[PDB]
Amino acid sequence: AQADKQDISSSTRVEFEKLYSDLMKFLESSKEIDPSQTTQLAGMDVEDALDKDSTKEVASLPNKSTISKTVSSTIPRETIPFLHLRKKTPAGDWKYDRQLSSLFLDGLEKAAFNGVTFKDKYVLITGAGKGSIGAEVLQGLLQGGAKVVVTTSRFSKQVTDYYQSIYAKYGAKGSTLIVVPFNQGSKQDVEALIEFIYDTEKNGGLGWDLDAIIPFAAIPEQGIELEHIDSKSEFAHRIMLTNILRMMGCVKKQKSARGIETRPAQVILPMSPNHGTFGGDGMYSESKLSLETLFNRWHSESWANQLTVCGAIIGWTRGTGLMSANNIIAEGIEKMGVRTFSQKEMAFNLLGLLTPEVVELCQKSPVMADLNGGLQFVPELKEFTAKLRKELVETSEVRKAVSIETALEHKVVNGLERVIVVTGFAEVGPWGSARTRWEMEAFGEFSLEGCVEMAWIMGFISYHNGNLKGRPYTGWVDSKTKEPVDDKDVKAKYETSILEHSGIRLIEPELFNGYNPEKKEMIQEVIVEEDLEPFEASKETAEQFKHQHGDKVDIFEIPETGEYSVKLLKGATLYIPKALRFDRLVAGQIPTGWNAKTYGISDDIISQVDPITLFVLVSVVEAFIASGITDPYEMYKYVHVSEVGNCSGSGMGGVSALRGMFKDRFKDEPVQNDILQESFINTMSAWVNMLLISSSGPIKTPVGACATSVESVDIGVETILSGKARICIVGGYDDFQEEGSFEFGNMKATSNTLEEFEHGRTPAEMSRPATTTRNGFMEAQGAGIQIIMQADLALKMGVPIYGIVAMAATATDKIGRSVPAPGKGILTTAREHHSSVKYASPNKRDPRI
Amino acid sequence: LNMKYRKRQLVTREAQIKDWVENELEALKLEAEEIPSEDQNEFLLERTREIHNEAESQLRAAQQQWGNDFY
């Protein structure tokens, strides 16, 4: 609806787009159309206080890429085309047989305007991603509709998201995207690689046919003349030619195993016209010349109906991240002998070398093609290449030399009432306050005023450094790292990279070393007994001997009276100790945290209440400043009978010392007797009652576990739907314990590493919903609280307010033979019940809704 | 009915409960004095400030439904 000015124009383009969508709806598999205003080269020798500029002009006579064919068409001087398609000259080399070359020109002319699809081409890539050519070769093949799979030399989180952007950015209607790490060298692996890409789905997967191939190489190998045939450059000389030669044969050997041999496969080969031509190259040149044996080899060696060779001479392209010497001149080359192509989108032409009307011609014959933009028409490339820079590097320098001596010369001479709202909310999750993670759901960055909140927690800063008495004189900043690095540690420009990742990469896995209380998880203390017959006579301290005597009866271990001492010891064949055993646990390391929990909180309550109860205790104050209402005594100035109050705290665990009561008691570790009050599930709210705001009104406390803390809202909102109570407070926390895991995953739910390691290492990931790699969700320690008010006292002297209450659970109405069974219609189908007796017209009980 | 209706909120109740505010004023207006004039304001401040509660009880009771319990 038109109230926003943009919205009308938005609506204008919408129907414009919608029609463009509707017209092309269910059409072909889109384009290859890289409609970006292609530039050229922009070198600019700055006169004054700067040197060489960079690049990216705008290119005169271009704009649309339609022109970019035509510009690349009629090349300069004695030329056929800038990029040509030659032929093996029936006696000689690669003469520009313009006959067949016309079609490639035409196919390029067929591009831009007409969309260029590539649906169902079955392609595979060796070369890199973000660095160079293949990403362009990737991208158009996505919008070509092609079924594509890709390798990578590296393997990281940094590359995994990288392609994950692109399939969400360029993957068309029918394209398929799957990645895999792959070392090009160490040639044994490609047999497993060629396995997996022709394997049936009852094997590793990907039942494809692989009908095009691009093997783009690596390893720059710079600055080496002839007499050095040295190390891994030699190994690099293998991986430019040997393995890729050993690649394409077993493709056919896999293909002719099935015998689908009247459907061939493309191979496009990166050729180089400049061999014996550049400088400190080493093995790179004559390795590139090795590819040309295939032209004779494609005839007369029985694989021609399977492999479709069409090489690519391409070179001298900017867009330098790697492999591109001279990110500098690009312009005198297009001036002295004006010949073209110092650009970045040569691969656009290479996409045209994977289309029909061409590959069918490649089914006829291999295609040598001088795609290189007339660069061979330069006599003496290399020294003239040096000659351009050596003039340019001095003139930049000598002007940069002019101003400094000018500056050297210059410097010297001078001197209602039942609908209820939420009012203060606060959770302590894995990260910091709820205000911290609300940025962390928004961004990855921590918003420096918010980032120091992450440093106020975890004990990282040392705020309240004395308003007086800083570093030797006065002056003060909220300090950090108690007394090495107290130097002024500011909430402005500082705290970046000095409180970062070491301060950030502690809250995600390895779960700790030594927190709960130790819980190594690399070794789990699992214990076995034994009953051999050595006999020892150790030493004791008295009154242990009687429970020694009571446990194993007098036919074993007659103790003795150990005269002038306490007693004496072991007798017979002992039937004990349950010593220990080094055992390995697989499942672990989902959560972590906070590394410090003592805010301004009263000590010696942390001797007693301890384990999980700190987290709720800080939380409710954290919700009260989220309410903006400290001093909870000052609620009763809205004078009541004070009969309203307490929360409905919940959680399955909290065991945390019951393991002390069960494992450590009966193994005698000194734990307080008063732990039985702290065993139960409501005693959290009791210190929310007693050593906090202290009305003795309503308390409910359900369990709701494995999906908990939503339920206490509903029973809490029932209490204010009832007149039995006004203002209330919610349930909350889960918690994590060492007996929790392993007895987690034995029920086979939560997660399991190693198959989380071994699939994609990525320990910060750990959560893959709905892109079909789920392993359960996760587990966290967690603590969370929301408070709610009567909407009227919430109005009258405003708390303030957040939002709107929504739902109502708990009518299960189901039985089976399973626990747990997920939420099917067992829940939330009585929600939106809506029995549908015959209405055909709209307008507590309500059989309609 | 699920649209934010308010019409039947205003028509049946919010007129009928507004019918006997003046007619509930009339319900006192048969006992106008009748031996008040010594107990007039006790006859005023007891009945009038308790029939306001009945209207107020009927106010939220009508507004039980029509939105707060529309379903």
| Residues A688 and A732: beta-carbon distance below 8 Å | no
Residue A85 Ramachandran class (φ > 0 left, ψ -120 to 50 alpha, else beta) = beta
The DSSP element (H or E) to which A125 belongs, if any, is strand A123-125
Interfacial residues of A (vs B; Cβ cutoff 8 Å): 416-419, 842-846, 848-849
Beta strands A147-150 and A176-179, pairing class: parallel
- Whether B37 and chain A come into contact, CB under 8 Å, resolves to no
| Residues A152 and A163: beta-carbon distance below 8 Å | no
Which chain B residue shows the shortest CA-CA distance from A841? B1
Residue A823 Ramachandran class (φ > 0 left, ψ -120 to 50 alpha, else beta) = beta
In angstroms, rounded to a whole number, what is the distance separating the alpha carbons of residues A646 and A698? Answer: 6
- Whether B68 and chain A come into contact, CB under 8 Å, resolves to yes
Contacts of A419 in chain B (CB under 8 A): 68
In angstroms, rounded to a whole number, what is the distance separating the alpha carbons of residues A598 and A603? Answer: 8
Please name the amino acid found at residue A139: Q
Which chain A residue shows the shortest CA-CA distance from B4? A843
A417–B60 C-beta distance less than 8 A:
yes
Residue A709 Ramachandran class (φ > 0 left, ψ -120 to 50 alpha, else beta) = left
| Residues A356 and A93: beta-carbon distance below 8 Å | no
Which chain B residue shows the shortest CA-CA distance from A416? B68
| Residues A379 and A78: beta-carbon distance below 8 Å | no
- Whether B7 and chain A come into contact, CB under 8 Å, resolves to no
Tokens 């399973």 locate to A818
In angstroms, rounded to a whole number, what is the distance separating the alpha carbons of residues A754 and A120? Answer: 35
In angstroms, rounded to a whole number, what is the distance separating the alpha carbons of residues A589 and A741? Answer: 10
CA distance A770 to chain B (A): 35
The DSSP element (H or E) to which A166 belongs, if any, is helix A157-167
**For chains A and B, what is the number of CB pairs under 8 angstroms?**
18
DSSP A593-608: --S---SSPPSSSTTT
Angle at the Cα of A531 from the Cα atoms of A529 and A534, rounded to 5 degrees? 125
In angstroms, rounded to a whole number, what is the distance separating the alpha carbons of residues A570 and A549? Answer: 10
Which chain B residue shows the shortest CA-CA distance from A844? B71
A843–B68 C-beta distance less than 8 A:
no
Q: Which of B1, B60, B71 sits opposite A843 (nearest CB)?
A: B1
Please name the amino acid found at residue A22: D
Contacts of A418 in chain B (CB under 8 A): 68
In angstroms, rounded to a whole number, what is the distance separating the alpha carbons of residues A109 and A58? Answer: 22
Q: What resolution in angstroms, rounded to 1 decimal?
A: 5.1
A844–B1 C-beta distance less than 8 A:
no
The DSSP element (H or E) to which B40 belongs, if any, is helix B40-62
How far is residue A291 from each of residues A176, A242, A368, A371, A501, measured CA to CA in Å? 30, 10, 11, 16, 47
CA distance A731 to chain B (A): 26
In angstroms, rounded to a whole number, what is the distance separating the alpha carbons of residues A504 and A440? Answer: 12
* Three-state DSSP state, A176: strand
Please name the amino acid found at residue A796: K
CA distance B27 to chain A (A): 30
Contacts of B69 in chain A (CB under 8 A): 844
DSSP state of A660: I
Q: Partners of A427 in the beta sheet?
A: A784
Q: Is the peptide bond before A379 cis (omega within 30 degrees of 0)?
A: no
B71–A418 C-beta distance less than 8 A:
no
A419–B68 C-beta distance less than 8 A:
yes
Contacts of B1 in chain A (CB under 8 A): 842-843, 848
In angstroms, rounded to a whole number, what is the distance separating the alpha carbons of residues A251 and A264? Answer: 11
Residues contacting A14, CB < 8 A, separation 6+: none
| Residues A718 and A805: beta-carbon distance below 8 Å | no
Q: How was this model experimentally determined?
A: cryo-EM
Q: Which of A842, A844, A845 sits opposite B2 (nearest CB)?
A: A842
Contacts of A416 in chain B (CB under 8 A): 68
Q: Which of A844, A845, A849 sits opposite B2 (nearest CB)?
A: A849
Q: Which of A418, A843, A845 sits opposite B3 (nearest CB)?
A: A843
Contacts of B2 in chain A (CB under 8 A): 842-843, 849
CA distance A526 to chain B (A): 59
The closest of A161, A171, A96 to A140, measured between CA atoms, is A171
B60–A842 C-beta distance less than 8 A:
no
In angstroms, rounded to a whole number, what is the distance separating the alpha carbons of residues A644 and A551? Answer: 53
CA distance A806 to chain B (A): 13
A849–B71 C-beta distance less than 8 A:
yes
Radius of gyration for the alpha carbons in chain B, expressed in angstroms and rounded: 16
Q: b/e string for A664-696 if b means 16 or more Cβ within 10 A?
A: eeeeeeeeeeebeebeeebbbbbbbbeebbebe
Angle at the Cα of A673 from the Cα atoms of A670 and A675, rounded to 5 degrees? 100
How far is residue A302 from each of residues A254, A258, A292, A307, measured CA to CA in Å? 15, 16, 17, 10
Q: Which of A416, A418, A844 sits opposite B71 (nearest CB)?
A: A844
Contacts of B60 in chain A (CB under 8 A): 417
In angstroms, rounded to a whole number, what is the distance separating the alpha carbons of residues A304 and B2? Answer: 73
Q: Which of A419, A842, A845 sits opposite B1 (nearest CB)?
A: A842
- Whether B1 and chain A come into contact, CB under 8 Å, resolves to yes
Contacts of A843 in chain B (CB under 8 A): 1-3, 5
In angstroms, rounded to a whole number, what is the distance separating the alpha carbons of residues A739 and A639? Answer: 47
How crowded is the C-beta side of A240, counted as CA atoms within 13 Å?
23
Q: Backbone phi, then psi, for A281, in 5-degree steps?
A: -95, -45
Angle at the Cα of A305 from the Cα atoms of A301 and A311, rounded to 5 degrees? 80
Q: b/e string for A185-203 if b means 16 or more Cβ within 10 A?
A: bebeebeebbeebbbeeee
Q: Backbone phi, then psi, for A16, in 5-degree steps?
A: -65, -45
CA distance B46 to chain A (A): 25
Q: Which of A417, A843, A846 sits opposite B71 (nearest CB)?
A: A846
Q: Backbone phi, then psi, for A88, in 5-degree steps?
A: -65, 115
CA distance B44 to chain A (A): 29
Q: Partners of A149 in the beta sheet?
A: A124, A178
A70 by Cβ neighbours in 10 Å (0-12 / 13-18 / 19+) ranks as: middle
Which chain B residue shows the shortest CA-CA distance from A847? B71
Residues contacting A318, CB < 8 A, separation 6+: A41, A55, A324, A327, A330, A342, A343, A344
A843–B69 C-beta distance less than 8 A:
no
End-to-end CA distance of chain B: 9
CA distance A702 to chain B (A): 26
In angstroms, rounded to a whole number, what is the distance separating the alpha carbons of residues A477 and A489? Answer: 6
Which chain B residue shows the shortest CA-CA distance from A842? B1
- Whether B4 and chain A come into contact, CB under 8 Å, resolves to no
Contacts of A849 in chain B (CB under 8 A): 2, 71
A844–B69 C-beta distance less than 8 A:
yes
Contacts of B66 in chain A (CB under 8 A): none
